[PDB]
């Protein structure tokens, strides 16, 4: 039967990153930790956002204890609020490697980028999902070095002229991390 | 599981274009390159647009340093905006060979021609896609000579009499092409 | 996934035509040519139409150069315009052999005939298709003789009392022809 | 192997006699041709020639008329018909000038017969014409000049079929 | 033993053109014709030259009787004059496909391009040869169509400030052609 | 047979650079691209030039749309001008890793360093070439991270006290590089 | 497998005692290290630690000195030595404070030992130091702080060997 | 083809040194380090030089960290400057074991010793190389002891009476060392 989660995968193509292998020998103990991060409360006014994933409350937080930390799955969901029905909202999004020179305004000039009309009594409010294609990027968000093609998220919001009382929909980004080899630091609090 | 990006292919029939075969010798290395080019922000007013995909802001630049390049895939995507629901819009679409004398005004008198009503009713806000039938077109976009049957897109727009405050939808052309054989020239910019 | 082309096949039964075979020997060279013909801009006011296919701009045109010309596929599409949402429209249609005494008003008293409610914010604007059952007719639209059971199209339009600014939907008829043995004539223009 | 058809034609190209005149004609662009080819992506000439039909004006007003088949990008001018191979010149009047077997076959064996393809060719057939009329000119055209042949076209060109 | 012909082959890489095959069946009779064309009398003053090979006295001339004509070998020789010893001269050259946007001034910014110091009592006056790599180009200089990557020659001359009485060296381009299927024309003279 | 382009390779020894291995997955299509970049017009006055080939007017542009690209081949070419004979010039050359603190002033205190006298005597006007030993360098020029041992060229120029009216020679860097993995960005220019 | 050498060292990093002081030290950048590595493309630490040598000033002027090994990009400040793992604080005076086995092994097992490679690493060893001196301060440095270890370098860096 | 490095090997004969073997057991880790040392800027005035290799900026420097250090290859290059053409210079050289009583003035009375005329518009400026025959000497430049037959270099310069503005040619000595077992010392700076 129906599932209240509808999705729009990103158009894609073969492009890949490079990474370094921790010295041979004993495989280090690793953990996997998942998450959902509130990244935007759209609808109220137009706005844009360029988000270098590696440093977002949720991720930053999690990883602050490991030298190496990789991404195992990543995606963004667009949860429509109760204002959506009365207030259609244009939302554009695109996954891109950190160092891609793109601005949210250029989502449409960029390959994968797409835009949606969220809201209106005639559209469906099924939460939207754009699984990020890490195949296309650099999954490591923390390593002994600084990769520059980690995932970057672009989001563009075009709100109603006669704007709504509050945020018309929420954008969160969820995923799962695989970290290891701990970072010494203020364990305190 | 539901998928947002909805599509409606074009009626078709067999018609082949004659292309030039590579001269005998070594097969050159080849690479693919995707893209998405802004085609038009319609909805505000009646308007038409016919263009030879072959030479456009994008493609022309990606091929700037190669002698040959054809299209592996190509399609048009109509992205409904927050205005589509409140302002239903008529959109004409049709793929034709460059040298086809057809004008947007005749999209309906043409075989493949298709017309769609954006927004205003149930299931009308999903991004619409009309893949180009390269199968019956001239794929080669850059070669040792110019063809005249390369992909040409025709778009027709019929806006509401009581027009909307902004574009009700955005039409973009996405696709990926292969290229090879370096064009020996000057490099500096 | 979804396809923006919905269809209503015509209720049918076993009834067939008769045709003459071009003299034995060398099979003549034949071509196939497809088309879409604007046949009606409904919605504005009630109206009816009895269309002897064989002579419609598109077909007439095409065939004017061959002694024999047959139909390989035929159907009618009802493309809803941007006025459809605000203006429901009743549209009835029926495929029938040329010499069937029926008038569009009697679509309902005739077997296959059907009627649709096009428009309204609650209905879907997917273009409607009634593939014509040539199995039931005489497919030859041009021969050494005059068959009288070639396809005839019946269409009835019941428009809103408080009528809409313009045509609420377009009806086109597309198909493909198989002609041969040329007709000598003013090739000029 | 796509399905093809052959279509024949006769195109009025010139009404001579009244005054002297030159003419360079890229065949693939004549009303007739342009027309049939309208709906296809590929058209080729299976055969072609020019023919001269003489009017009743002729006997009274003999006319010098020369013609020549040539490949589109040949530098020739009607002035030099007789200096080139296909070159031929005829009179038109009070002599064996009325029999209609007055035609000149074009030798496509010597040029590009393709007249519509995915590209532009420069050696399609071109037809030269040089007319030299009577000083004391005739009242009406002294003869008609047509070009006929047959076309082999395939692969449909998608356009507005309506008309 | 020594041979008074010294050469500087052009640095190269894999890039190729495309061509059309004359209709199958009887192979047409073809001839090969060689030549040497005086293209420049350098030394006297600085000067540059962009030479679309296909149309140079020698070639033009030869080919004016055939529908199709291809190149079998091509190269440029720089014959030093008797003024060379007393008057060193800078000469730059580069082979390039017709439609490469390069100017002689940019020979150095272009891959293959090279420059030589011709003259001076201390250099050798062995004639210089830069065999052109047709492998890299479009060898057909005359066909049923207009290729745009036929060979183009770029030459730059930097002459002595206190210039010499006359041309310090001659540049000729020699090669061999393979034509067929004759062009009807004024055979006269 | 004689060949003009004369060359003198650099003294060498083994020293490897550590590069990043492509993450597991599909091998992306790759293409090569040659080039020649103007390095300096010397002879008029004493001058030095040290530059990281990695990022230069040329290369930077050819790679603008790819994520990875290394150097298949690289070398320096000294092209004597018509002034070289009359004005002998000293030229210092040496290939070193980007992070090598060596300055042109120390080309001679460095292992590979080489010095040449241009013109003035017998056999001194032939274009001189010093291939770069990528074998003992960091080839990768564009990757998921920046290296600091990439090719770096050092040039030293010592002109005649009674200087020449113009550059006695031109130093250029030629080579070809391979690239793959498309960098997803905006296309318009 | 390139040929490698191991080279040891002791680097004076700080003369404490005179006044309170903080210190964050990215090891790979200390005079000693910088030096040996000068001629190679790759250097790694096979072992490393900090040691505190006490001066004769010490008995008279006890000093609070803490230290901590940490990975280059750890957000810690000497102020928080004791809040982190490797953290350790010592006194320096009229107690078991003169024995020189006053060293703290750095656990490279917990960080990146590479100190020069074809790239820049951000987790190489960093050493924190927090000194708290006597209000009525001593005349001279109260103790010396050095860092010693051994380097494993390979692959020659081509430069001006002259000096 | 030609290589801008010409050489004059030293006339030689069978004579050899003696060395001590580090105690049996575990072979110590060793490194090899190459170099080029500026040893003389000749041309300006006559001058001589007796160079006990073991202690020359480059070597001294390198070895200052090992107990044992041997030579694997050694030679001297004579790089002609831009003054060479106008200013011929006599240069004599000879390889000799440290304790050989010879002075540069006696190069000619000594077996291997040779002299060259560097410069003049009629001679070639190819850099000269006299690979040193360590076979003939004591290759160890640093050991647990003091060998006295390590390589010594003798050089004699006879400059033009009407001397040149600056150094007419450079003499450098390059080689490669194999050291091991480190020397404890001020690692500082």
**CA-to-CA distance for G23 and G15, rounded, in angstroms?**
12
Strand partners for F153 = F51, F95
Instruction: Annotate E22-53 with b (16+ C-beta within 10 A) or e (fewer).
Output: eeeeeeeeeeebebebebbebbbeeeeeebeb
Q: In degrees, to the nearest 5, what angle opens at C-alpha H8 toward C-alphas H6 and H13?
A: 150
**CA-to-CA distance for C154 and C17, rounded, in angstroms?**
20
The partner residue sitting opposite F57, judged by closest CB among B32, B59, B187, is B187
Q: How many C-beta neighbours within 10 Å does residue B75 have?
A: 19
CA-based nearest residue to F97, from G159, G35, H33, G29: G159
Q: Are the Cβ atoms of G162 and H29 closer than 8 angstroms?
A: no
Closest chain D C-alpha to B102 CA, distance in angstroms: 5
Q: Are the Cβ atoms of H2 and F109 closer than 8 angstroms?
A: no
Q: In degrees, to the nearest 5, what angle opens at C-alpha A25 toward C-alphas A19 and A27?
A: 70
Identify how many contiguous H helices and E strands chain F contains and give both numbers: 1, 10
Helix residue ranges per DSSP H, chain B: 57-63
Interface test with A, best of F64, F184, F187, F189 (most A CBs within 10 A): F184
Closest chain G C-alpha to A153 CA, distance in angstroms: 25
* H/E run at residue D125: strand D125-132
CA-based nearest residue to E166, from E73, E96, E77, E82: E82
Correct CATH for F1-189 of 3.90.650.10, 3.40.50.720, 2.60.120.20, 3.40.50.10140: 2.60.120.20
- Cα H109 from chain centroid? 20
**CA-to-CA distance for F93 and F110, rounded, in angstroms?**
10
CB-based contacts of G55, cutoff 8 Å, min separation 6: G17, G140, G141, G142, G143, G144
Give the count of alpha carbons within 13 A of H21, CB side only.
5
Closest chain C C-alpha to D135 CA, distance in angstroms: 32
**CA-to-CA distance for B150 and B152, rounded, in angstroms?**
6
> DSSP for G6-31?
EEEEEEEEEEESSS-EEEEEEGGGSH
The partner residue sitting opposite F111, judged by closest CB among H34, H81, H123, is H34
Q: Using the structure block, give the residue that is written with the tokens 């599981």.
A: B1
Residue H98: C-alpha distances to residues D87, G161, H51, H113, H154 (Å): 99, 23, 9, 15, 10
For chain H, which chains pass the contact test of at least 3 CB pairs under 8 Å?
A: F, G
**CA-to-CA distance for E28 and A145, rounded, in angstroms?**
66
CB B151 within 8 A of CB B52: yes
Q: Are the Cβ atoms of F127 and E8 closer than 8 angstroms?
A: yes
Closest chain D C-alpha to E169 CA, distance in angstroms: 36
CA-based nearest residue to F166, from F80, F46, F39, F44: F44
Which residues of G fall within a CB distance of 8 Å from A24?
none
Q: Are the Cβ atoms of B31 and F30 closer than 8 angstroms?
A: yes
Burial of B55 (0-12, 13-18, 19+ CB in 10 A): middle
CB H44 within 8 A of CB H163: yes
CB B37 within 8 A of CB A109: yes
Q: What is the CATH number of domain G1-163?
A: 2.60.120.20
**CA-to-CA distance for H47 and H52, rounded, in angstroms?**
17
**CA-to-CA distance for H2 and F2, rounded, in angstroms?**
9
CA-based nearest residue to A185, from G71, B100, C116: G71
The partner residue sitting opposite H4, judged by closest CB among F8, F108, F159, is F8
Strand partners for G146 = G12, G51
Which residues of E fall within a CB distance of 8 Å from B146?
148
Residue by residue, what is the 3-state secondary structure of E11-39? CCCCCCCECCCCCCCCCCCEEEEEEEEEE
Q: In degrees, to the nearest 5, what angle opens at C-alpha B70 toward C-alphas B69 and B76?
A: 130
Q: Which of residues 70-129 of B touch E (CB under 8 A)?
A: none
Which residues of E fall within a CB distance of 8 Å from F32?
13-14
Closest chain F C-alpha to E180 CA, distance in angstroms: 35
Residue A132: C-alpha distances to residues A34, A45, F67, F145, H102 (Å): 15, 26, 18, 21, 78
The β-bridge relationship of strands G4-16 and G143-156 is antiparallel
Structure obtained using? X-ray
The partner residue sitting opposite G155, judged by closest CB among F16, F100, F102, is F16
Q: Are the Cβ atoms of F111 and H36 closer than 8 angstroms?
A: yes
SS3 B104: helix
**CA-to-CA distance for C87 and B157, rounded, in angstroms?**
19
Which pair of tokens denotes residue H129? 């190389």
Strand partners for C156 = C48, C92
> DSSP for E35-79?
EEEEEEEESSS-EEEEEETTSSHHHHHHHTTEEEEEEEEEEEEEE
The partner residue sitting opposite H85, judged by closest CB among F5, F88, F116, is F88
Nearest residue in A to B3, CA atom: A7
**CA-to-CA distance for D128 and G137, rounded, in angstroms?**
114
Which residues of A fall within a CB distance of 8 Å from G119?
145
DSSP state for residue B26 in the 8-state scheme: P
Q: How many C-beta neighbours within 10 Å does residue A2 have?
A: 8
Closest chain B C-alpha to D154 CA, distance in angstroms: 8
CB F92 within 8 A of CB F156: yes
Q: In degrees, to the nearest 5, what angle opens at C-alpha D127 toward C-alphas D124 and D129?
A: 165
């Amino acid at each position: 039967m129906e599932i209240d989660k509808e999705l729009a995968p990103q158009d894609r193509t073969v492009t890949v990153a490079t990474v370094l292998p921790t010295v041979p020998g004993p495989s280090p103990f690793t953990i996997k930790q998942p998450f959902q991060s509130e990244v935007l409360f759209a609808g109220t006014k137009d706005a844009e956002a360029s988000l270098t994933i590696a440093n977002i409350d949720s991720v930053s937080t999690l990883t602050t204890f490991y030298r190496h930390a990789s991404l195992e799955s990543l995606w963004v969901t667009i949860h429509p609020t109760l204002q959506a029905p009365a207030f259609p909202t244009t939302v554009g999004v695109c996954w891109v490697p950190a160092q891609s020179p793109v601005t949210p305004t250029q989502i449409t000039k960029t390959y994968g980028g797409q835009i949606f009309c969220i809201g209106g009594a005639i559209q469906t409010l099924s939460p939207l999902i754009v699984k990020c294609p890490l195949e296309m990027m650099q999954p490591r968000v923390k390593d002994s070095i600084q990769y520059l093609d980690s995932p970057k998220l672009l989001i563009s919001i075009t709100a109603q002229p006669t704007a709504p009382p509050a945020s018309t929909c929420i954008i969160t980004v969820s995923g799962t991390l695989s970290m290891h080899s701990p970072l010494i630091t203020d364990t305190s609090t």
